[PDB]
Structures are given as C-alpha cells and as structure tokens.
A = this chain, B = another copy of it.
Amino acid sequence: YSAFDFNCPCLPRYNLAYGLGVLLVPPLILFLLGFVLNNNVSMLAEEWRRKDAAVLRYMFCSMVQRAMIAPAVWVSVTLLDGKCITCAFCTSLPVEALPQGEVKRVLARIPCKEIYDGQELIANEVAVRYLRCISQALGWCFVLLMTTLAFLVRSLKHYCSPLSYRQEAYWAQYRANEDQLFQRTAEVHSRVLAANNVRRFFGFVALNKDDEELIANFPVEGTQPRPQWNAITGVYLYRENQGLPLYSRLHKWAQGL
C-alpha cells in the first residue's frame, strides 16, 4: 500500500476506468493469493480431476470463506479512505446542486490536481467534501453488507455442511493432526531409506545423535507402492458406513483393509 502512490489521470474518460481498476483488481489478486498460498487447492484439483456434491461443496464453501477475508478488508480500507471513488465518480457529480467537452475536462481535473480552474463550475473543497461523503457512505454500507452476509452464511452454511457442529470441530482437528503426522513420518521414513541407500554404497553414514537414534528405532526396507499410494490422495467424503464413520481417504483405506 505504501510503495504504490495513488495518482489520478485527470482525463474525461480515463478516470472511470482507473478508480474501478484500483478498487477491483487488487482484491482479485489477494483473493487468488488466498487460493495459491493454501494447499487444499491441489486436493480440489485432484478431486475434480478424478465422493458426492455435499462434502465437496462443503470444502468449497469453507475454502472460499477462508479466502474472502483479504479483499473484504482491502475494499473496506480503500473505499473508506475515499480517494478511489473521488477519482472515479468525478465526471458525474451534478453541477445543478453545488461546452460539454470543457465541462467534462475540468470535472476530471477536479480531484487532487490543483490545476483546477476553481471557477463558476464548482468550488474546489465542496466537491471533495461531497465525494468523500458519498464514498464513506458506500463504504460503511459495504462493510455492513459483508458482515451481515458473514452472519447469514454462518447460519445457512452450518445448514449446508452435512455434519453437525461438534463433528465439524472434530473433523477439522482430525484433518490437521493427520496432515502433520503424515508430514513428519514421511520425513523420517525418507531419511531412513536414504541412509540405507548411502550406506550400501559407501560403507557407512555419518550421523549425529538424533539421526542415529531414528535409524536405530525404526528400520525400514520398502515404502508403499504406487497404486495404494495414489489410492490415498484426494479430498475425502464423510463416508457414513453403517455404525462407523470415516473422516479421510486414509481412514477409509485403513478400515477397509
């Protein structure tokens, strides 16, 4: 926000297409960053590559809700600082309350230019005041819309997701824990396999304390093959088997065999 100096094209047609630009595009960027920086995007890409609409829509509407939080605050802070709409809806504030070509020209010259004629068209500061007024008004209205939508979507999306609230918490915590344990175990298993491979070539492997302990405790020969490995990955449905639930594709493949 700092290294990007907001400046205005004092032009009769390039304001409408610049205020809306600086108001909409950075939100889109923060939004798409909310996806790329997240990791479950790859899970969803896999799922749509190769389960029913219920749980899929649930994870969709959870990822979106988790990502929408950057553009909300950005739009809020900018639309409230006023400068955007000032630069944007300047070619249209009616002269009836405060050469068409020259009219539009000077009106576009209004915002933060001080090349303004300051003449019988409009005074300088009164126009800035009116525009910052309408801007801040729309900004508060937008923040209201966003928060009331957050409330209503809380309710109606706890209606969407098939599980109740407590299972929601349990499922979230389980996904987190399984992911972390899988990461760490994968690292350790990999280090062991690499140590065995190197040892079979050189004759020994220089290891510090903890690595030597990990080699001693968990000997490993061969990692799971590719078919089952591929069978693991993906986003899982809550597969409510008769009497027992399933929380992740790993859990399904485990209980199944």
Chain A residues proximal to chain B, CB less than 8 Å: 3-5, 7-11, 14, 18, 21-22, 25-26, 28-29, 32-33, 35-36, 41-43, 45-46, 49, 77, 80-81, 97-98, 113, 115, 123, 125-126, 129-130, 132-133, 136-137, 140-141, 143-144, 147-148, 150-151, 154-155, 158-159, 163-167, 169-170, 173-174, 177-178, 181-191, 193-198, 200-207, 214, 218, 220, 222-226, 229-230, 232-233, 240, 243-245, 247-248, 250-251, 253-254
Summarize A's interface: helix, strand, loop or mixed: helix
A158 in contact with B46 (CB, 8 Å) = yes
Contact of A169 among B164, B183, B204 (CB under 8 A): B183
Contact of A8 among B35, B113, B133 (CB under 8 A): B133
Contact of A206 among B129, B159, B174, B214 (CB under 8 A): B214
A sample of 5 cross-chain residue pairs with beta-carbon separation below 8 angstroms, ordered by A number, consists of: A5-B132, A169-B183, A187-B206, A203-B218, A206-B214
A204 in contact with B230 (CB, 8 Å) = no
B166 in contact with A254 (CB, 8 Å) = no
Contacts of A140 in B (CB 8 A): 21-22, 25-26, 29
A197 in contact with B165 (CB, 8 Å) = no
Contacts of A123 in B (CB 8 A): 115
Contact (A10, B190) CB under 8 Å given A32-B151, A206-B185: no
Contact (A203, B220) CB under 8 Å given A165-B42, A197-B251, A250-B198: yes
A28 in contact with B144 (CB, 8 Å) = yes
Contacts of A4 in B (CB 8 A): 80, 136
A-B contacts besides A3-B77, A173-B187, A225-B245, 15 pairs, CB < 8 Å: A4-B80, A14-B133, A29-B143, A32-B151, A45-B158, A163-B226, A164-B230, A166-B232, A177-B190, A178-B198, A181-B191, A181-B198, A182-B198, A204-B220, A223-B245
Give bound CA distance, A163 to B209, whole Å: 33
Give bound CA distance, A245 to B5, whole Å: 54
A18 in contact with B133 (CB, 8 Å) = yes
Give bound CA distance, A159 to B178, whole Å: 25
B174 in contact with A36 (CB, 8 Å) = no
Give bound CA distance, A5 to B49, whole Å: 50
B164 in contact with A185 (CB, 8 Å) = no
Give bound CA distance, A88 to B134, whole Å: 15
A204 in contact with B233 (CB, 8 Å) = no
Give bound CA distance, A140 to B28, whole Å: 11
